[PDB]
């Protein structure tokens, strides 16, 4: 009566490949790893399987081909019973444009769809296609069982009110300039879980979801559907992030260019690689540093306060999307699951809404534990660990198997 | 009777008024636009009925203020001796100026230094000051500068810093400064009067909607956050200004659509906002009148109200547990009933419920509470920035 449906989850960048084998039915992880430092002498691949840690090098100047070669011919070859059990392959895509509102099975037209959306993700989307092309060559058996899962799909339920910028409308009509967001897969996941935790249908769910980790985004959920999100055309907009600025006076770009002599490419690299938490603390991108030192160091305090200021205002701003009812706020992601004070300090600014954190409960909801962190009688607040890998596995399985 | 000459100088236009700083009585109005052009003309309304004349062809501030002395104040010489001070509107006071000040050489120097932030407006204000001191010799020690950025200087670093490299603030003063400060200040003081409580205990969110749009968060009578930033571009949807955008849109337009920095800069400030949304006009009156019958107006109304409603919502994070009222002011804010209603209608979670009958009454220079009786207060207060200039000018020279 019981069954397993193992799916290979792949997350391909231009110099990285995050891979995992998940049983879509129950969520069991059979393998996970990371092949990094592509086209360099350092080129290595790390993995936890049974699960203990193994590290090997693929060779100086290694590409995605040998990255899947090592998985097939070295890792999967030892456990052939595991290899045969594979029923599908899921691919994460950063940007799916307006064409893709949900996960889809990969064919020639999807390859083109990803290629056409590449305009919005010029660095990430091309790398997905390389990984997609290698998965078809390394796994011939699963060539009609490849599925694409879009970071943006979940945000396509947004009404025009939310996706349109106050720019020339022609810019949308003929160039697709629109709010698309990201972390859609995570935003979806925590919504489904919040239903379990609030003991109510996902269809009746009015929550504000905060994915804070590798990038940061807040989303406004109305009746289970996303009606607004913090990231925009690109992942640059919204929250204070590890290395990204988020919201700025757009005119700053012009002030950096015309007054400070910085090139478009210089400014682009600053807002993307040199801003955010690295910008505020002239030290590091790591939120763990700020979480620990904000009580003792000035640079850490200024970073924390700006961060939490930004987060609190976004939660507060999405009351405009709630149509009179807010069931709970949700925290998730590397930071959202682990950083207690970030949750305490940012929600503490929202007393008007009815938010106040319990310290004892807040600390308890860390390092994988899920829980309600709100003080009793106050508006619900949940820590729910995310699982983007699982969503890709579930979707890849449902549409293929 | 404390009479003040209020001056608002720009690149090609000098806007002027004589206001009584005791009771707000206007004794004169004016506008000397089209400088350095054949269209050089004046439009001076007065206690005695209005008229329009022509300054000349290729005119400057020196001629404008002299025309006020030799012609405008020639017919009415009773109020010339009545002048006690002069008030200058300054766009950017930088970090230096937290309140209005008496103009000496260090203030001139201060406005020069700030001119990095308002390169078009601040040098022009200086020419205005220059001519005001020579055209009105009697009042050379009685010129007062009122700054659009002054009121927001009570902002903590939590609000005024962008998540950029900290050196950009340290070395270059890159910071949130805002605007409409003289308006946000005024309506704050008035809200206290209407809410029958002290300004020092006043927690409100203020919305100046008109020539540009700005929302401010006030805690205990002090501004703690504002929607506009380094420049007036950031924040709300405005006439031609985009407000908040994904910063990357600029890089996309530049790198993908081949647009120049100048071309994107023009678009964002002159081709966007309501003009961008409705491919028709920047005029908000179009949006107010047609949002129920025309698609383009509806599109623009919804997006406008969405941005405003979110901003008001976002500033609950600054209220520290208590929000007394939301305030609407400015050309748009005082008169656009449905703009007020549609945006506050999105904030039901917060307890906002617009009373339509009250909403319609509070229009055209009329103040009033537009909220339903048991619900969270929402007030319309007509701003008076010229009076605040007159008051500051008069109070600091008595």
**A274 to chain B: nearest residue by CA?**
B165
Please confirm, yes or no, whether B296 is among the known catalytic residues: no
Please indicate if the annotation marks B208 as binding a ligand: yes
- For residues A8 and A71, give the distance between their C-alpha atoms in angstroms, rounded to a whole number: 11
Is the domain of B250 the same as that of B388? yes
Q: Is B241 annotated as a binding residue?
A: no
Q: Are A347 and A356 in contact (CB under 8 A)?
A: yes
- Kindly give the residue spans of alpha helices, DSSP state H, lying in chain B: 61-67, 73-75, 105-114, 122-135, 157-160, 167-172, 181-194, 248-255, 261-266, 273-277, 284-290, 295-314, 330-335, 337-344, 356-361, 385-395
Backbone angles phi, psi at B85, to 5 degrees: -160, 170
Query: Experimental method for this entry?
Result: X-ray
Q: Where does a domain end: A178, A199, A220?
A: A199
- For residue A2, the Cα-to-chain-centroid distance in whole angstroms is 31
Both A33 and A89 in one domain: the answer is: yes
Do the chains contact at B174 and A252, CB–CB below 8 Å? yes
In sequence order, which residues have a C-beta less than 8 Å from that of residue B49 and are 6 or more positions away?
none
Q: Is B365 on the interface with A (CB under 8 A)?
A: no
* CA distance linking residue B260 with residue B253, whole number of Å: 8
**What is the C-alpha to C-alpha distance for residues B67 and A94, in angstroms, rounded to an integer?**
64
CB A320 within 8 A of CB B347: yes
Cα separation, B336 vs A396, in Å, equals 51
B283 annotated to bind ligand = yes
Is the Cβ–Cβ distance between A80 and A135 less than 8 Å?
Answer: no
Query: Can you read off the two tokens belonging to residue B55?
Result: 């300054």
Residue that is last in its domain, among B196, B229, B257: B196
Q: Which of A28, A50, A144, A151 does the annotation list as catalytic?
A: A151
Phi, psi of B267, deg, nearest 5: -50, -55
Distance from CA of A257 to the nearest CA of B (A): 8
- C-alpha B236/C-alpha B343 separation (Å) is 12
| Three-class SS state of B267 | helix
Contacts of A207 in chain B (CB under 8 A): none
DSSP assignment of A342-357:
HHHHHHTT-TTTT--B
Burial zone of A50 (CB within 10 Å; 0-12 exposed, 13-18 middle, 19+ buried): exposed
Residues 6 or more apart whose CB falls under 8 angstroms from that of B84 comprise B2, B3, B4, B139, B142, B394, B397
What is the edge-to-edge ordering of all strands in the sheet holding A6-12?
Answer: A53-57, A44-48, A29-36, A17-23, A6-12, A86-93, A146-150, A104-105
- Cβ contact, residue pair B349, A325, below 8 Å: yes
Closest-CA residue in chain B for A275? B164
The answer to whether residues B143 and B243 belong to one domain is no
A131 is annotated as contributing to ligand binding: no
Please check whether residue B161 is in contact with residue B176, taking contact to mean a CB–CB distance below 8 angstroms: yes
d(CA A231, CA A243): 15
**Same domain assignment for residues A254 and A193:** no
Q: In what helix (H) or strand (E) does residue A340 lie, and over which residues does it extend?
A: helix A340-347
The answer to whether A240 touches A218, Cβ cutoff 8 Å, is: no
- Compute the distance between CA of residue A300 and CA of residue A239 in angstroms, rounded to an integer: 17
CA A367 vs. chain centroid, Å, equals 18
Is A317 in Cβ contact with B313 (below 8 Å)?
Answer: yes
The two three-digit tokens of residue A66, written as one number: 């040998």
Q: What tokens does A351 get?
A: 């007393």
Catalytic residue chosen out of the listed positions B148, B324, B355, B392:
B148
Query: B391 and B265 in one domain?
Result: yes
Residues 6 or more apart in contact with residue A98 via CB below 8 angstroms: A156, A176, A178
Q: 10 Å Cβ neighbour count for B18? A: 27
List residues bridging with B28 in a β-sheet. B18, B46
Please name the helix (run of DSSP H) or strand (run of DSSP E) that holds residue A10, with its range, or none: strand A6-12
What sign for the dihedral angle of Cα A270, A276, A279, A283?
negative
Is residue A328 within a helix (H) or strand (E), and if so which, with residue range?
A: strand A328-332
Taking Cα atoms as reference points, which of A140, A25, A40, A49 lies closest to residue A390?
A: A25
Mutate to test the interface with B, among A160, A240, A256, A352 (most CBs of B within 10 A): A352
Question: CB-based contact (8 Å) between B350 and chain A?
Answer: yes
Cβ-based burial of A277 (10 A; exposed 0-12, middle 13-18, buried ≥19): buried
Q: Are A349 and A296 contacting, i.e. CB atoms less than 8 angstroms apart?
A: no
Cα separation, B92 vs B116, whole angstroms: 9
Identify whether residues B191 and B135 lie together within a single domain. Answer: yes
- Cβ-based neighbours of A50, under 8 Å, separated by 6 or more: none
User: Residues B202, B172: one domain?
Assistant: no
Residues B379 and B258 in one domain: yes
Task: With CA atoms as reference, report the closest residue to B263 among A268, A169, A254.
Answer: A254
Q: Å from A54 to nearest chain B CA?
A: 38
Split into its structural domains, chain A has a count of 2
User: B276 in contact with A at a CB cutoff of 8 Å?
Assistant: yes
Cβ neighbours for B76, distance < 8 A, ≥ 6 positions apart? B28, B46, B47, B48
Helix residue spans in B317-384 (DSSP H): 330-335, 337-344, 356-361
Q: What is the DSSP letter of A224?
A: T
The answer for residues whose C-beta is within 8 angstroms of residue B305's C-beta and 6 or more apart is B339, B342, B343, B346
Domain membership of residue B364 as a residue range: 197-398
Query: Residue A113, class by beta-carbon neighbours within 10 Å (0-12 exposed, 13-18 middle, 19+ buried)?
Result: buried
For residues A165-182, one letter each, b for 16 or more C-beta atoms within 10 angstroms of the residue's C-beta and e for the rest, the string is bbbbbebbeeebbbbbbb
A179 labeled part of a ligand binding site: no
Question: Kind of pairing, strands A6-12 and A86-93?
Answer: parallel
Is residue B313 less than 8 Å (CB to CB) from chain A? yes
Q: Which residues of A250-265 are buried (b: 16+ CB within 10 A; e: fewer)?
A: bbbbbbbbeeeebebe
C-alpha angle B88-B93-B98 in degrees, rounded to nearest 5: 100
Inter-chain residue contact B164 with A279, CB threshold 8 Å: yes
Q: How many residues can be counted in chain A? A: 401
The verdict on B234 and B171 lying in the same domain is no
Rounded to whole angstroms, the Cα distance separating B282 from B287 reads 9
In the numeric block, the tokens 């903590």 are attached to B156
The answer to whether the beta carbons of residues A223 and A204 sit under 8 Å apart is yes
Residues B172 and B38 in one domain: yes
CA–CA min distance B26, chain A (Å): 37
Torsion angle in degrees (nearest 10) through CA of A92, A94, A97, A100:
10
Residue with tokens 């401010």: B216
Same domain, A213 and A344: yes
Q: At A231, which CATH number?
A: 3.30.420.40
- Cβ–Cβ under 8 Å, residues A251 and B233: yes
The domain boundary, picked from B196, B220, B237, lies at B196
Residue (of B109, B148, B108) closest to B130 by Cα position: B108
- Helices B337-344 and B295-314: crossing angle in degrees, nearest 10, is 60
CA dist B383 and B186 (Å) reads: 7
Helix (H) / strand (E) element for A393: namely helix A388-400
Answer yes or no: do A143 and A194 share one domain. Answer: yes
User: Reduced to 3 states, what is the DSSP secondary structure of residue B135?
Assistant: helix
């Amino acid at each position: 009566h019981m069954s397993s449906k193992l799916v290979l989850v792949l997350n391909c960048g231009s110099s990285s490949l995050k891979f995992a084998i998940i049983d879509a039915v129950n969520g069991d992880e059979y393998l996970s790893g990371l092949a990094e430092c592509f086209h360099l002498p350092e080129a290595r691949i790390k993995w936890k399987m049974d699960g203990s840690k193994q590290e090997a090098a693929l060779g100086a100047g290694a590409a995605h081909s040998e990255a899947l070669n090592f998985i097939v011919n070295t890792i999967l070859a030892q456990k052939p019973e595991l290899s045969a059990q594979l029923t599908a392959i899921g691919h994460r895509i950063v940007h799916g444009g307006e064409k893709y509102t949900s996960s889809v099975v990969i064919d020639e037209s999807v390859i083109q769809g990803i290629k056409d959306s590449a305009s919005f993700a010029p660095l990430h989307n091309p790398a997905h296609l390389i990984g997609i092309a290698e998965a078809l060559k390394s796994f011939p058996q699963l060539k009609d069982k490849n599925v694409a899962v879009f970071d943006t799909a979940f945000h396509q339920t947004m009404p025009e009110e939310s996706y349109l910028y106050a720019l020339p409308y022609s810019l949308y009509k003929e160039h697709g300039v629109r709010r698309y967001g990201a972390h859609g897969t995570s935003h979806f996941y925590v919504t489904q879980e919040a239903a379990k935790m609030l003991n109510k249908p996902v269809e009746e769910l009015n929550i504000i979801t905060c994915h804070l980790g590798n990038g940061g985004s807040v989303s406004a959920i109305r009746n289970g559907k996303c009606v607004d999100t913090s990231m925009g055309l690109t992942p640059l907009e919204g929250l204070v992030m590890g290395t990204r600025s988020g919201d700025i006076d757009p005119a700053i770009i012009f002030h950096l260019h015309d007054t400070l002599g910085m090139s478009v490419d210089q400014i682009n690299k600053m807002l993307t690689k040199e801003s955010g938490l690295l910008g505020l603390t002239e030290v590091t991108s790591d939120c763990r540093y700020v979480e620990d030192n904000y009580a003792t160091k000035e640079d850490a305090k200024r970073a924390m306060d700006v961060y939490c200021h930004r987060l609190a205002k976004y939660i507060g701003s999405y009351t405009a999307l709630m149509d009179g009812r807010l069931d709970a706020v949700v925290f998730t992601g590397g930071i959202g699951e682990n950083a207690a004070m970030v949750r305490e300090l940012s929600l503490g600014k929202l007393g008007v809404l009815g938010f106040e954190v319990d310290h004892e409960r807040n600390l308890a909801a860390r390092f994988g534990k899920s829980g309600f962190i709100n003080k009793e009688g106050t508006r619900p607040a949940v820590v729910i660990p995310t699982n983007e890998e699982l969503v890709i596995a579930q979707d890849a399985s449902r549409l293929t198997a």
